[PDB]
Structure 1
Amino acid sequence: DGVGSSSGNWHCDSQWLGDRVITTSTRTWALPTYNNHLYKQISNSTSGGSSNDNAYFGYSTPWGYFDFNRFHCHFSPRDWQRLINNNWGFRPKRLNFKLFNIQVKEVTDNNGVKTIANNLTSTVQVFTDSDYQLPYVLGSAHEGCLPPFPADVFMIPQYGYLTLNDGSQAVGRSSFYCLEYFPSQMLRTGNNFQFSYEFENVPFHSSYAHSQSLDRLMNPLIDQYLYYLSKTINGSGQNQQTLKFSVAGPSNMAVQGRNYIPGPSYRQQRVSTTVTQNNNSEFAWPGASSWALNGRNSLMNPGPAMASHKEGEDRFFPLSGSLIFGKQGTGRDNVDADKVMITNEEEIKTTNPVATESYGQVATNHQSAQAQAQTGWVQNQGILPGMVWQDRDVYLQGPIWAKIPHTDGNFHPSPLMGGFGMKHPPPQILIKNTPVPADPPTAFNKDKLNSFITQYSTGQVSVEIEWELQKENSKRWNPEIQYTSNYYKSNNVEFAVNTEGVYSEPRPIGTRYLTRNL
């Protein structure tokens, strides 16, 4: 429309209907100029990369993108508490995105003094990739998200992708995507962008624990009509052999028969938060569970969802099998254990095996009069018909969704890190501010113009998601566990701003408090 009329209002509210939530958010963003309007073929050989497992090849683009898919973007700590205390499950339904109130600024730096001026005729060009024809970055949980606190202004991250490689070289199947080669919408100040998206049907994330375990499904009062082999030995002494059977019953459980078995396991190494209980050596990389693909060992981060620890022992956690979050202002490298936030998976102890323990035990050999019965340990168990498991839990800081890779087959395509796997997730929104060149020379030259005006843009994003809720039906008598702010006095308020104006989330908040029967 025009320069003096606003493109859109700030709408941050969230409305709770019965079966449905609609959470609107609005932020202020700032978009710089990336790569000086170039595509630079990034590879490991540019800097270091002396290990084959770290080899990569790809391209970096001037474009930048919006990643809103962490949970803290769309939920306040109170709207999250209201969510997870009152509801068994949820899932997204619709998505609506808006760009408005765009402003483009010119910067002139001369004699070290710099003047920022406003370009009314400049454009910024933005498109959504609806057909998934570009490498999908978002589902990888990289930084650059809408800040959790609505008053922050955030930079838009740079877009770039990786392709096939042999070492640092490019293999003939490598693809190159020119992002200028897509239809986009060019926006001046007084233009606004929007689009709508409908999530495909995804199973409700289960926010509950289980009020009974998998190995106790039974009436403790009554016997089973099925037997087991209780006694293989008549008595002590030679040639004493007999087969005695016994009714499996409350006196001896864990020998009863049962219809279902716990989920699969891939063992992780156990490491204790107490320092002295750990070994003295470097076991971090060497002693870690990995998966190798095409000669590259990819360390196995968050794998099959598995209980992090057993019973009341919290001292230890799986090496790579847990999510680790940083606190506010946490360093980049060699951070002490107190500044990281380690996540606790113990809610699934009922249906899932412990991550650091063997799935079970199997017989190695056939016994005979000569040969003793020998049993080995099962470190990993892929699946068995009749297994039952649960997915890894959802947090405020964790990702909302991921993209299920397009492939011939996949089993239970729920993201190993967390969230809602989708064949067609909400599309990427890429944004770039169009180049404005400096004065061309008078005489014509064949070469392309490498001199541009230093420039950046600013605006607001509105992202509203419509969520579908599954209400608690529980007939339980005694009171539930809920998520609370502990009342004791403190220098600061949790999930509130600091004295310097810094917003910090004290602890990771899981989704699982309410319980259901197994």
Structure 2
Amino acid sequence: DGVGSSSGNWHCDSQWLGDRVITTSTRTWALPTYNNHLYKQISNSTSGGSSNDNAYFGYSTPWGYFDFNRFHCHFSPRDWQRLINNNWGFRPKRLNFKLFNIQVKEVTDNNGVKTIANNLTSTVQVFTDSDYQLPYVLGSAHEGCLPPFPADVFMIPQYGYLTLNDGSQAVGRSSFYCLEYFPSQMLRTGNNFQFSYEFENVPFHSSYAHSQSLDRLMNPLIDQYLYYLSKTINGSGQNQQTLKFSVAGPSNMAVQGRNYIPGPSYRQQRVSTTVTQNNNSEFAWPGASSWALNGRNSLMNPGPAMASHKEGEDRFFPLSGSLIFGKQGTGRDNVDADKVMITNEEEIKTTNPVATESYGQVATNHQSDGTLAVPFKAQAQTGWVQNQGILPGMVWQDRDVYLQGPIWAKIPHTDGNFHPSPLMGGFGMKHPPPQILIKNTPVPADPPTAFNKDKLNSFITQYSTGQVSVEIEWELQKENSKRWNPEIQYTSNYYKSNNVEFAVNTEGVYSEPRPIGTRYLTRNL
């Protein structure tokens, strides 16, 4: 311990074991003081924005939190390639978290001059919400994480939460949390923080595409011993109704009897990246699939995992069915299509319905010739099935994970859930990795010599710095294919370019070229 000794070392390697890859990553963080050490209440009226769908009520906190809920926080692009190129699945096993080499620095403003001196006696407060009794804000895909490049220094995002709102107003059930009501650990520059977590049993993420389609699952050489109705009439005429049956075989695979059906659907609007093919109207919000809760509408975004487009239609994407990432230096609002990268889910078109199609059709009447009830002869009529819930015999794949994307989500604590895999992709857990909340301990400037009962709003301006390390052990599923054919692999290209992909440029800014998914290997259905 002490000022002159370091409380930890830098460790950002990857170690590949038999069936385990252990990722470690160290980053340098900076923590400012948030809210001037206050617990301000926030609303949509607080920021002035007015829309019932956007109305909120909640609390801003003086605490920051650590987010490492993205894959690029733990995998280099090369490590990601090494994982996705020969592994059918992976899952997290255990997590280790370290916080070391903390330094609190006091900034002083004399006549508009910033002088930074370090404050050896000030502390920083840290705790992990291990009993899950705080609102959980990891798992909402927030831009505050550990940076992908190990040489970057990041600001810690401010922690805050929303509670129940009646528009801009709170209600009786609205809960307020003082984070200072939890027991924290106090650290002053000689101290470090260690946290260990075991992931609950999650299924392996399917790191493969299917080399076989759900409708092409039979032997193409042999008939089926089942019959289907093939003819209902005997050609043109009146009163010529028959009932002919024929064997389902390889010549007519569409009518073949099947044991399993494609997974559920919730249709989305189709938007093409060739804008001339799009309608000359504003339909981004009006014309977007949504769900309603307590009288307000949320974009589906991204909804059930569906195939982004049909074979031969890569220009089309669902309106809110895909994850869209910014490239690098992309601005917050109204950026051009080329400024963002749209991911697709085309590998799951073998089992999942296409996001912008309508999942087949159902009968919507009784076809008839004529009865006693009516003399109206009705021909068979079909309706389109735009949204289909789960049926028995239904199989599907989940959404892919990306290097840029999230790793885990917290399953909401409810009486019932179905297949609680997060819709944005990743591992859904009842008890995810706990939030780590961190705060500079307020240091009052100087009290008045006579007593005053007010709560001392004058403080010394200071921020903390440190190193954070995250260690995750991942269990791997080794690909064991008997396929003779060479497989599709993620690769870099051997063509001369200005910069190397997944490197820094002449400026020194690191950028990621495209969103890399985990489905390159193949399996039979």
Query: For this structure pair, what is the TM-score category when the shorter chain's length is used for normalisation?
Result: over 0.9
- % identical aligned pairs: 100
Post-superposition Cα deviations, 1:455-479, rounded to whole Å, max 9, x if no partner, equal 0000000100000000011000010
Matched, 1:354 2:354: yes
Aligned partner of residue 277 in structure 2, secondary structure = coil
After superposition, give the CA deviation of every residue in 1:423-482 in whole Å (9 maximum; x if it has no partner).
Answer: 000000000010000110000001110000000000000100000000011000010000
Offset of residue 99 of structure 1: 0.2
Superposed CA offset, 1:202-237 (max 9, x none): 000000001110000100000010000000002210
Structure 2: runs of 5 or more not aligned: 369-376
C-alpha separation in 1, matches of 2:315 and 2:4: 61
- Paired with 2:486 and 2:51, the residues of 1 have a C-alpha distance of 55
How far apart, CA to CA, are the structure 1 residues paired with 2:289 and 2:313?
A: 22
How far apart, CA to CA, are the structure 2 residues paired with 1:378 and 1:113?
67
Quote the RMSD (CA, aligned, Å): 0.5
| Alignment correspondent of 2:438 | 431
Give the distance between the partners of 2:17 and 2:38, measured in 1 at CA.
Answer: 48
Distance in 2, Cα, partners of 1:256 & 1:375: 20
TM-score relative to the length of structure 2: 0.98
**Alignment partners' CA distance in 2, 1:515 and 1:162:** 43
Q: Which residue of 2 aligns with 1:234?
A: 234
Q: Name the residue aligned to 1:6.
A: 6
Partners of 2:335 and 2:348 in 1: CA distance: 29
Per-residue deviation, 1:49: 2.2
Q: Deviations over 1:330-359 (max 9, x none)?
A: 011010000011001101010000000001
How far 1:18 moved relative to its partner?
1.1
Higher mean C-alpha displacement, 40-49 vs 135-144:
40-49
How far apart, CA to CA, are the structure 1 residues paired with 2:6 and 2:378?
Answer: 86
Instruction: Name the SS for the 2:438 alignment partner.
Output: strand
How big is each residue's C-alpha offset from its partner over 1:96-135, in whole Å with a ceiling of 9 and x where there is no partner? 0000000000011011111100111110010001000000
Q: CA deviation at 1:308?
A: 0.2
User: What SS does structure 1 have at the residue aligned with 2:275?
Assistant: coil
Equivalent-residue separation in structure 1 for 2:266 and 2:70 (angstroms): 27
Q: For residues 261-286 of structure 1, what are the alpha-carbon distances to aligned partners after superposition, in whole Å with 9 as ceiling and x for unaligned?
A: 00000000001000100000101110
3-state DSSP of counterpart to 2:73: coil
- Stretch moving more, 327-336 or 42-51: 42-51
For the residues of structure 2 that align with 1:275 and 1:182, how far apart are their CA atoms? 53
> How many aligned positions are there?
517
Deviation at 1:503, TM superposition (A): 0.1
Distance across 2 between alignment mates of 1:47 and 1:344:
35
**In 2: Cα distance, 1:99 partner to 1:146 partner:** 13
**Match in the other structure for 1:22:** 22
Q: Matches of 2:106 and 2:74 in 1, distance apart?
A: 32
Question: Secondary structure in 2 aligned to 1:42?
Answer: strand
Residue in 2 aligned with 1:496? 503
Question: How many Å separate the matches in 1 of 2:36 and 2:223?
Answer: 76
Deviation at 1:418, TM superposition (A): 0.4
Residue 347 of structure 2 aligns to a residue whose secondary structure is: helix
The Cα of 1:46 is off from its aligned counterpart by: 1.2
2-structure distance, mates of 1:442, 1:124: 28
Matched, 1:388 2:388: no
Task: Measure the CA separation in 2 of the matches of 1:22 and 1:235.
Answer: 70
2-structure distance, mates of 1:226, 1:114 = 84
Counterpart in 2 of 1:277?
Answer: 277
State the Cα deviation string for residues 131-153 of structure 1 (Å, max 9, x = none). 00000000111111000000000
Superimposed CA distance per residue, residues 354-407 of structure 1 (whole angstroms, 9 cap, x where no aligned partner): 000001100110011x11111000000001100000000010010000000000
Secondary structure at 2:366's aligned position in 1?
A: coil
Deviation at 1:315, TM superposition (A): 1.1
Three-state SS of the structure 2 residue aligned to 1:276 is: helix
Task: Determine the structure 2 residue equivalent to 1:452.
Answer: 459
Distance 1:254 1:114 in 2: 75
In structure 2, the residue matched to 1:179 is: 179
Partners in 2 of 1:71 and 1:444 — Cα distance?
Answer: 53
Segment of structure 1 superposing worse, 28-37 or 233-242: 233-242
Cα distance in 2 for residues equivalent to 1:162 and 1:44:
11
Query: Matched residues in 1 for 2:251 and 2:365: separation?
Result: 30
1:47 is displaced (CA, Å) by: 2.1
Residue 127 of structure 2 aligns to a residue whose secondary structure is strand
The Cα shift of 1:50 comes to 1.5
Structure 1, residues 271-315: CA drift from partner, whole Å, max 9, x if none?
100010000010111010000000000111011100000001111
Partner Cα separation in structure 2 for residue 14 and residue 46 of structure 1? 45
Indicate yes or no: 2:485 matched with 1:478: yes
- The equivalent residue for 2:265 is 265
SS at match of 1:349: helix
Aligned partner of residue 45 in structure 1, secondary structure: coil
**Deviating runs (4+, > 3 A) in structure 1?**
none
Query: 1:269, 1:203 → 2: CA distance?
Result: 31
Distance 2:19 2:119 in 1: 47
C-alpha distance in 2, partners of 1:446/1:12? 49
CA deviation map 1:20-76 (0-9, x unaligned): 010010000000000000010010011222110000000000000000010000000
- Distance (Å, rounded) in 1 between the aligned partners of 2:72 and 2:46: 35
Gaps of 5+ in 1: none
Match of 1:461 in 2: 468
